[PDB]
Amino acid sequence: MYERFTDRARRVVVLAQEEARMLNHNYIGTEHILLGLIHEGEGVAAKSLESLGISLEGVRSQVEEIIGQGQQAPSGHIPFTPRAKKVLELSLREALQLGHNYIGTEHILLGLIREGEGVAAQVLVKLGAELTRVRQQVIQLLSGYLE
């Protein structure tokens, strides 16, 4: 299904793996998808998170508090966690329901909040961004793009 991801959404997934690697992590979790959405810096997901006061530094601090780093950066392919897999599956449905045949950054963010249970969701709530508020912000920004 990666064939349906936009270039920027693919870049987010590629960057999520490197967010994990540079933290000496051995799985790509939902929190690394969150970091990648912010760090790539251009798409509707990044805009939505910035506009809710969710910064890369806020997320990094919470990930260090909740997960912490390993001892060594791994080589090779880092596997997705069960919850990260669920996020990427759910992204497909978010896109279809919003009338898109492609999966953009916003749909990965929407999948992440739909899963709603893993480390990224915990971080967002801890940083003051309730899941319904994140969803409604994405909708609000998307509506502005229809002008």
Binding site: M1, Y2, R10, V13, A16, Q17, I78, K85, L88, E89
Partner: peptide, 7 residues
């Protein structure tokens, strides 16, 4: 799809 980047 759906285990690694980008399978």
């Amino acid at each position: 799809w759906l285990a690694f980047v980008l399978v």
